[PDB]
Amino acid sequence: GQIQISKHVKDVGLPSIHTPTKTKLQPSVFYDIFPGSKEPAVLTEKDPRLKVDFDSALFSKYKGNTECSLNEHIQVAVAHYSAQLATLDIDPQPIAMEDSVFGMDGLEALDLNTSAGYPYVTLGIKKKDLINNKTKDISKLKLALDKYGVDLPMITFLKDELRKKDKIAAGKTRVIEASSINDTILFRTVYGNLFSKFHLNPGVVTGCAVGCDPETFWSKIPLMLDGDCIMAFDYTNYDGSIHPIWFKALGMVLDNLSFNPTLINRLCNSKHIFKSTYYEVEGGVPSGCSGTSIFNSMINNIIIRTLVLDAYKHIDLDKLKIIAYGDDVIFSYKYKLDMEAIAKEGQKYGLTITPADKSSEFKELDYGNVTFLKRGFRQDDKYKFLIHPTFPVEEIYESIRWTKKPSQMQEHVLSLCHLMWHNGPEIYKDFETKIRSVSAGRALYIPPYELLRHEWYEKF
Fold this sequence. Notes:
It is built from 18 helices and 15 strands. It is of the alpha+beta class. It has 3 domains: 1-13 and 70-202 and 244-283, no CATH class; 212-243 and 291-366, Reverse transcriptase/Diguanylate cyclase domain (Alpha-Beta Plaits); 374-460, Mitochondrial Import Receptor Subunit Tom20, Chain A (Up-down Bundle). The longest helix has 20 residues, at 181-200. It starts with a strand and ends with a helix. Mg(2+) 2 binds at residues 234, 327. Interacts with Viral protein genome-linked and with protein 3CD. Mg(2+) 1 binds at residues 234, 327. It is found in: Host cytoplasmic vesicle membrane. Residues 228-341 form the RdRp catalytic domain.
């Protein structure tokens, strides 16, 4: 996206916003027993590890929009995907505010711990002041919605997380844009029935994987994505590279389903505060707020359709099976397509597509080497039809080496075990032994391989 406006906060009647500058990340008890090189992302200009201007390296996410327009192919992609989603018969009416706050079927309750955004972050007001979870009373919230209204600036926080070592000195730390609670509630109100239907129906009709459980969903993917050709590739800066035309296209699908097609352009043309600067961006999807993962998935469905259409012009879209989780996508067609040919068609829209898993060349894929949500695919030993989701061993080793809270170590390690065992008993037994070499790991419950495997069979 492109920065259209940039102003000092004191010149437009706004205050400075103060965002956490120190990491909660700390070496854990397993730091010296597992290998790794990730460190907490730089969170401030004064970090001694920096070797670059911090504010410039963050604002490089925004480097212009390519000159392009709607075409017939994007248009047929819109009509095809729309007719597919109509199959679901989503209720276009808004949901009650009670359901937006405390949830309903397919819509998780609002997180009451994260920031409430502008203006509440400057007023000493948190979410639990607006919403009482004990009584389910939202009277304070309703007054704050009336008083402050909607379409408020997003606060851009810096994501406190582990990063590869080369991204530390280069000041390459991710930005998340926490929208106001006022606006998250508006988006849930308008689009809540769509969000619910997607979460409850991950697969090839929504074209979306949000709300899936990889443990059981992995077995279904080969059934859904039939056709001789399994395809996947990676995007460079997906969120930032999405031109305004893809929001018009998304607006058109929402309109075909009788949903508000306009609220969406507040994501496209967005307003922000970072520290002491107010700024506005045209293009790009704000990373980390209202319906982000679903809207990105829907947009990816449009892109993949139009890109295949641009590269090949006797295509049958009924046979182009797609599953997307935001920027991450896997798809199939009834016969072999050239992924390089399809990727090249992205350039004219301002999309940058490289081969999957940081590969050198665009090569053919099968389920033996394809990745989705960081995971590979491996047939079970006894039942070859059940597919293990395979989480990278390296990412588990780096994760275990750090904590944000030592008290919740039992939960942290158990989560890692549930990921790890899918890579096989040999790698899992090595994992267990290293954990039990220190006395803090001796104190934990570490599930045996056989109980994990038996528990998994029973989830199906």
